[PDB]
Curated annotation (Swiss-Prot):
Its main location: membrane. This is Alpha-xylosidase BoGH31A. GO terms for biological process: symbiotic process benefiting host; xyloglucan catabolic process. One of its GO terms (molecular function) is hydrolase activity, hydrolyzing O-glycosyl compounds. Catalyzes the liberation of alpha-xylose from the non-reducing terminal glucose of xyloglucan oligosaccharides in xyloglucan degradation, converting the 'X' to 'G' units. It catalyses: Hydrolysis of terminal, non-reducing alpha-D-xylose residues with release of alpha-D-xylose. Disruption phenotype: Severely reduced growth on tamarind xyloglucan and completely abolished growth on XyG oligosaccharides. Gut bacteria supply the human body with energy from dietary polysaccharides through glycosidases that are absent in the human genome. Xyloglucans are a ubiquitous family of highly branched plant cell wall polysaccharides present in the vegetables we consume. Enzymes involved in xyloglucan degradation mediate the conversion of otherwise indigestible plant polysaccharides to short-chain fatty acids. It comes from Bacteroides ovatus (strain ATCC 8483 / DSM 1896 / JCM 5824 / BCRC 10623 / CCUG 4943 / NCTC 11153). CDD domains: GH31_N (cd14752), GH31_xylosidase_XylS (cd06591).
Amino acid sequence: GSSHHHHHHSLFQGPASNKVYEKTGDSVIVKVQHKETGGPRLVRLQVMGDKLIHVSATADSKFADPQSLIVVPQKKQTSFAVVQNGDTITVSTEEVKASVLASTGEVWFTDKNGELILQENKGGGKTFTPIEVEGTKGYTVCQVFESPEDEAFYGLGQHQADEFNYKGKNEELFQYNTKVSVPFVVSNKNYGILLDSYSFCRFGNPNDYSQLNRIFKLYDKTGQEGALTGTYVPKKGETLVRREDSIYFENLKTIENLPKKLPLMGAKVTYEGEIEPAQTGEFKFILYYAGYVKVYLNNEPVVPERWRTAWNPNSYKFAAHLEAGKRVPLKIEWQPDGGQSYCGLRALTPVNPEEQGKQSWWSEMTKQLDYYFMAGENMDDVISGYRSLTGKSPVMPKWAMGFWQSREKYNTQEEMLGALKGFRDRKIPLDNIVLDWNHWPENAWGSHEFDKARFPDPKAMVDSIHAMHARMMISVWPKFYVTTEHFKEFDENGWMYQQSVKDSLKDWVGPGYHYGFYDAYDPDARKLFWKQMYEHYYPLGIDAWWMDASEPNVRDCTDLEYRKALCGPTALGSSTEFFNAYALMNAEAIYDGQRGVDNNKRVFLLTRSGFAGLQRYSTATWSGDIGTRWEDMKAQISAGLNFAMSGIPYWTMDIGGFCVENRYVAGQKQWNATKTENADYKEWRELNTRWYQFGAFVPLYRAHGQYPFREIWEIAPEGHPAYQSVVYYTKLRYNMMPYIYSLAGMTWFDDYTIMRPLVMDFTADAEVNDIGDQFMFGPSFMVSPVYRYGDRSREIYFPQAEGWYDFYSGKFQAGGERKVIEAPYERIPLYVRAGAIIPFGDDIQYTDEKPAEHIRLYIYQGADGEFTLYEDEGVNYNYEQGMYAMIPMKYDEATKTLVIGERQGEFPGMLKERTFTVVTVNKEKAQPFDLNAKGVTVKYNGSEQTLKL
Ligand SMILES: *[C@@H]1O[C@@](F)(CO)[C@@H](O)[C@H](O)[C@H]1O
Ligand code: NI
């Protein structure tokens, strides 16, 4: 008879091995009754919270159940029922019903009324393939879910391909300078999925891209099959023309396939011919590039010009419908812009839209499948589930919400202190000043000592920064030179990765030095790493830590196989299994380290990589070594929005870009010599102006990068429109500080998110689903950056709402329409939602320079609204013990009534008495933003007051 007839499971208390399922305390384990090759044997539903379900599956006859690196213990047990009804077993909490079929192990989730939220691939969507690495065993796993046509997806980290809304899209999840992977997605169907894997993963297509010669017939410039043509025009000498098998020069091994006797700096390279596919459909291409690049396909400019500095290539994707058997022209124009540079083009063959639309996860190596489902009333509630599972985000120190000035790099104590004093002298507000790498003696990276010729008294430097009411952040790497005592202490305990040592790698500094990176997955290595920081930097009074190369970036531009060799083995297993969580491990070392020394003092860490759970360590990510390019600026909008949707609410970017086009450096040198502006230097000024405008509305407002200097007075002089604009926005950040710091309080108290795609607040208006170039800054402000040189307007979609108001003029704009909006050089388009209650304070030079005694409470009428003004001591964790104050405010449109609520809580130094001026903006009253606006004066002492406007 059937396999089922011969072998199937089915007394209240007999051994579980006789039964189809077993309920324990918080889970049900189901034995799959129709086992398939590569399918699950066991599927477990574990209840983590009313809205939180942990799904595990394995091909083995027991679960490995390793300790998660990301999910923390939960606060309380959760009550639930289980019902078995034939093939269906359903676990129900008060808020969700999670069902599994015994036959296949397939899972689905509904709300309390049985409305479907998420369904696994019909018949099952899980596949297991064994993998063995370095004597450790595990599985490569795929998990696929059904997805309706109107579902939209956000998250996955911070990627640099300008993708927004991942429905039907692909992304590879690994870490590399500018690319931060977080295995979490949020849907507009109000749930999230967190995949608990630390290996290389993929969302969408589970396959690697293919070289062009594997999927197309190629014809060269002369029409000869078997290749494309590569034409290399050097800066000096003879042009070389050859046939190319494939366009794939993407790492140190494959760039050796470029022509041997042809210098690439200043070269112009053209790859061209025709391609012919063998099937019909949408081909998905990926371009890997450094230097300047353009791509044309079928006579269409599919990739308008992009650039990265030669050493930090990026990926950009495009797709095209192609017909089987038809030749189409292809042309790539490439200016390598360095002696070593990168260019590659690969593709995926068409996937049926029915399959390509599904939600597909692939994981190279884990011990079992583990994922977490979190349902929500809205996307904020989904994020709250993620915060419950992976830890709440502490309130950043208030000073971190001000302006940060950085440089690659301040070279001396005098230079750094001079920059700070420049802000104070010019009355341009600033909280934070940053000391980058190379502050140590040249031969002593990892010693954590200062070069005393350039920094003669580091303690006096920090004391001077504090005397000017600023905070100091310092660069710290997980990299140590082999000659240092600190390296030797890791090494003698087996806590240094050896591949870089074995291979005699030299870095770029001076003659080149030998180095390694430490194993942050070892708990004792983490404690040593912190102890070294504690012995050398902490006593100087340094406030904040800036960790570079936390991917880890052991060697630039290497292939996957060599990157894995460079960063393992780890204390937990192979680097194949433990590939993506290095930054998280380092964040644990620093946060737990510093709170171990002083539990009261706030922690600030900024790191280049990231992972799920990062936020629990009061750690932000920055988007890394991006280019001084309009297209990179644009990409930062979508990258930041996806990062926010990945659950991590503090994020930043190098305003202006990190790596600088040569023409901009030459523009600056000309300015220094002659005080004349060339065409490139004009562009430099406009790029920085627009990028500062954007940056003023991201969670951390920070300028950094390579030469030119990035202080505003270096970019343009007083009176120049760039100076006037950037100083306007810098000041505005500080006038907004009562609002901004309330958002920071909300990150902890309400599991909030600061930089928000429109889909979060306007989920019901599906026109917002693909908009990745506008965003909300908190609940009230819609920001629409200008990201093209010369533009003095841009198209803006106003989500469906009672209305919107131009911030600058107060003029009304209807919801639910798209229009071209003016955007002068000096202004970023900025609108306020009807119903907004926004507190503004007076000019200050730094956070808390003065108490916020007089706040202007702007009420943008036309809809109901609520806002809570949050305050605390700013610098310590006393809010964790209830030392904070909230002033809730509520506005009712129907009665035009504002309630300023009774104050809840108190703390040391809190204003007991204060003043509000309540200022209205409405459809009949276009009130420009103005601190001196006419309104109603309220003297507030903590007691509720009600105003009828
Ligand atoms: C790591 O490298 C530096 F230290 C030097 O380029 C920093 O300035 C960069 O911002 C960071 O990516
Ligand atoms: Ni030491």
